[PDB]
């Protein structure tokens, strides 16, 4: 039935794609670092694209992963930025959901003229207890079908907790 | 037979015109196909026909081919 079927936030990953290396990358990394409380990780570019202007391996994006109640707090701040309204398209078939926001001023960092303005992509990964079965090195296994997270369960949880409503489209 | 006999002149070598004992382009005989199609265990396709087998899952064998199980 429901002894330990309770959904929880596995992680919150915050992604910023400035698109080109340098001062803008460092400023976005500083914004991510002060928001998370952790140092962020920059991610290299896989392939050279002329239209974007990117070459291979210039650390073109910066992202951070936060777990636990701190991640829950930043998700609360993101949802009150989004006014607790999310599209049905935002949720995925696996049960994970994300949204994208513009500027950290709405998050309330306040503005420095040097640092500029950078928007963010918030993504929440949802799992039940017992997810260690896939992650552990010894006796790695696949999770059973009933215990899997799904879109209907995650939208029901998102309606019940955070007292939010989903948009029909 | 006359159409195949006219077509045989365009070919080298020797060819024979044989009236087959099968029903159409299938591989069963005429009375075998007749006693198969009186039951509902054949079901038509675009030009060919799909046949029932005693293997497989019963749910799929009942959503297809309903008249034979309507016994």
């Amino acid at each position: 039935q429901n002894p330990m079927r309770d959904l929880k936030i596995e992680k919150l990953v915050l992604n910023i794609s400035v698109g080109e290396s340098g001062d803008r990358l460092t400023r976005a990394s500083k914004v991510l670092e002060q928001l998370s409380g952790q140092t962020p990780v920059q991610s290299k570019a896989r392939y050279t694209v002329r239209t974007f202007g990117i070459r291979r391996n210039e650390k073109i994006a910066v992202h951070v992963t936060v777990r636990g109640p701190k991640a829950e707090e930043i998700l609360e701040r993101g949802l009150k930025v989004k006014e607790y309204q999310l599209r049905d398209r935002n949720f995925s078939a696996t049960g994970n959901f994300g949204f994208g926001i513009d500027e950290h001023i709405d998050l309330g960092i306040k503005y420095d003229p040097s640092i500029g303005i950078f928007g963010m992509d918030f993504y929440v990964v949802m799992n039940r207890p017992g997810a260690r079965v896939t992650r552990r090195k010894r006796c790695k296994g696949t999770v059973g079908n009933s215990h899997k997270t799904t879109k209907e369960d995650t939208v029901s949880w998102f309606k019940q907790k955070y007292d939010a409503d989903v948009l029909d489209k | 037979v006359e159409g195949l006999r006219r077509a045989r002149y365009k070919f080298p070598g020797q060819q024979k015109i044989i009236l087959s004992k099968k029903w159409g382009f299938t591989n069963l005989d005429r009375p075998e196909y007749l006693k198969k199609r009186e039951a509902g265990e054949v079901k038509d396709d675009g030009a060919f026909v799909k046949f029932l087998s005693k293997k497989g899952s019963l749910e799929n064998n009942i959503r297809e081919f309903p008249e034979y199980f309507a016994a």
């Binding site: 090195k137 010894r138 006796c139 790695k140 296994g141 | 019963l58 009942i62 199980f69 309507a70 016994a71």
Partner: protein, 294 residues
């Protein structure tokens, strides 16, 4: 509709080995362990297999035959209450005591125990069981840590240290023991001795009992139930060590029942297969049910 595998895929699929499918054996490591120099013809190669489950430490001495692996002697951590250790059956010192127990047990049953007494007075120094002259060589054994991560401070090396001080000749270097400084390539013996005698749990016991008492009631509850304070665990490790060096003889349990007595209940509880005729009756009833126009 999405998670569907074709018959071609399932026909061309090659399964791995069963232990690899279960995720319990690294065969790349197993080949390098159990193979022998072919000029040593039928000489067995012996593995100290150390495995860590929850609530247990498993130590075995295992050689390999074609029909399967063969165990000389095994020593688990749940038989440490016989030697006086009741709490912390998976800590680093429990791994040490289990290694010491399996070492003393193997040298006793091989008869190599009156010689090669091992490290009687332990101090945390790094040394190996050297060969005594004009006599037999010490028993040589190699670790099998399995899929477990090699890490400075891991308790597979505590099991190694216990087995090495027990008198086994196990080849090892000292750079994975706790207390190994990385920048100065030397081993600190007093921290390793503190870990052998449980210093890392007793120091935590003190530094958590002085401030946070609800945690001190949540964990270490059995220590209060058996009135074990912080300083006495050192001497109960010492008494456990001398009890092991007294008798590792391994009296087994009395099993409370017989094999067929357990087998009767478990055979009653296990589910059985459905035969061909009743399967045919089942599918005939199903045809008469759904396809019989309800």
């Amino acid at each position: 509709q999405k998670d569907a595998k074709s018959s071609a895929y399932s026909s061309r699929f090659q399964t791995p080995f069963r232990r690899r499918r279960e995720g319990k054996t690294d065969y790349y490591q197993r080949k390098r362990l159990v193979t022998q120099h072919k000029a040593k013809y039928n000489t067995p190669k012996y593995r100290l297999v150390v495995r860590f489950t929850n609530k247990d430490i498993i130590c075995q001495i295992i050689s390999s035959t074609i029909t399967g692996d063969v165990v000389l002697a095994a020593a688990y951590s749940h038989e440490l209450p016989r030697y006086g250790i009741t709490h912390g059956l998976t800590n680093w010192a429990a791994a040490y005591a289990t290694g010491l127990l399996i070492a003393r047990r193997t040298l006793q049953k091989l008869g190599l125990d009156e010689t090669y007494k091992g490290v009687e007075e332990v101090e945390g120094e790094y040394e190996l069981t050297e060969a005594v002259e004009d006599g037999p060589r010490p028993f040589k054994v190699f670790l099998d840590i399995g899929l477990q991560r090699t890490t400075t401070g891991a308790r597979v090396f505590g099991a190694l240290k216990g087995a090495s001080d027990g008198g086994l000749y196990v080849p090892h270097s000292e750079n994975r023991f706790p207390g190994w400084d990385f920048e100065t390539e030397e081993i600190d013996p007093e921290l390793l001795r503190s870990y052998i005698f449980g210093g890392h749990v007793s120091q935590y016991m003190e530094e958590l009992a002085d401030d946070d008492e609800e945690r001190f009631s949540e964990l270490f509850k059995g220590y209060l139930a058996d009135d074990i304070d912080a300083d006495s665990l050192e001497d109960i490790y010492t008494s456990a060590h001398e009890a092991i060096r007294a008798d590792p003889a391994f009296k087994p349990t009395e099993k409370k029942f017989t094999k067929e007595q357990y087998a009767a209940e478990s055979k009653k509880y296990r589910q059985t297969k459905l035969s061909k005729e009743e399967r045919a009756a089942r599918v005939a009833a199903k045809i008469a049910a759904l396809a019989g126009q309800q």
